[PDB]
Design a protein around this ligand. Structure first.
Ligand SMILES: *[B]([O])([O])C1=[C][C]=[C]C(C(=O)[N][C]C2=[C][C]=[C]O2)=[C]1
Length: 244
């Protein structure tokens, strides 16, 4: 019973209050809706940053480059965060957004195979260039927030060109929140090596009854904001629209 005018104002305000510029795109069935305080972001291109982990994992598992239970050893060298100085599964690495695990996986896959799986999946601008281990962080691979939500819609519905079983395994890695019988599956993205910095939270809500509502939040990370603003805004918006 809320006017759409009021949903629009309430969601814009969640971005206004964090003092950033951003958008969240929601997909109900085949219908895309854009909210936020910077609507024109919707079809601009940004690096996927760690959102790429979802595709990177799909590629690695499908092509037998790791298993769901394989433990990637920490090599013992100092890491940018101490939470990374441990051995982990791809799943654990997904939750921690541990890039060196995912770069290990990228190296196993190899530049050639990576390029072909990324052209095959039609992901973003599909260009990975010559560096197998940072293409999703500093370019040249770029994707828009529309493409990101459509990629989430595909994964959520198992429509990507990977075995059903590969898709279920990557989806088990993605559960970040349970809120009143709804489950939020998603991956965060933080473009730290680019100016300005991009922040993403891409996924879908799986409702009490099996409807799945894909979404993609996309904003600018400002000097010392924390990661969880991405989540917080996503959750405020989703609740505001009665999706969760
Ligand atoms: B991801 O979006 O969660 C993510 C995690 C850790 C590190 C990065 C990253 O963007 N590193 C970039 C780096 C390369 C040169 C300078 O900084 C992303």
């Amino acid at each position: 019973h809320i006017s759409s005018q009021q949903h629009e104002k309430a969601i814009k305000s969640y971005f206004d209050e964090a003092q950033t510029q951003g958008v969240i795109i929601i997909k109900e069935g085949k219908n895309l809706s854009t909210y936020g305080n910077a609507l024109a972001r919707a079809n601009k291109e940004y690096v996927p940053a760690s959102t790429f982990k979802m595709l990177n994992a799909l590629i690695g598992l499908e092509n037998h480059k790791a298993t769901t239970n394989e433990i990637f050893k920490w090599d013992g060298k100092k890491r940018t965060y101490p939470a990374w100085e441990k051995d982990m599964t791809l799943g654990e690495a997904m939750a921690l957004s541990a890039v060196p695990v995912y770069q290990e996986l990228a190296r196993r896959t190899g530049l050639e195979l990576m390029q072909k799986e990324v052209k095959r999946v039609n992901f973003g601008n599909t260009n990975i260039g010559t560096q197998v281990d940072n293409f999703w962080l500093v370019g040249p691979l770029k994707i828009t927030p529309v493409q990101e939500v459509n990629f989430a819609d595909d994964l959520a519905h198992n429509r990507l060109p990977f075995k059903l079983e590969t898709q279920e395994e990557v989806k088990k890695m993605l559960l970040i929140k349970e809120v009143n019988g709804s489950k939020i599956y998603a991956k965060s993205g933080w473009g730290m090596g680019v100016t300005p910095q991009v922040g993403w939270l891409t996924g879908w809500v799986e409702q009490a009854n099996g409807k799945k509502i894909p979404f993609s939040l996309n904003l600018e990370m400002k000097e010392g904001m924390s990661g969880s603003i991405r989540n917080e805004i996503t959750y405020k918006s989703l609740e505001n629209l009665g999706i969760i």
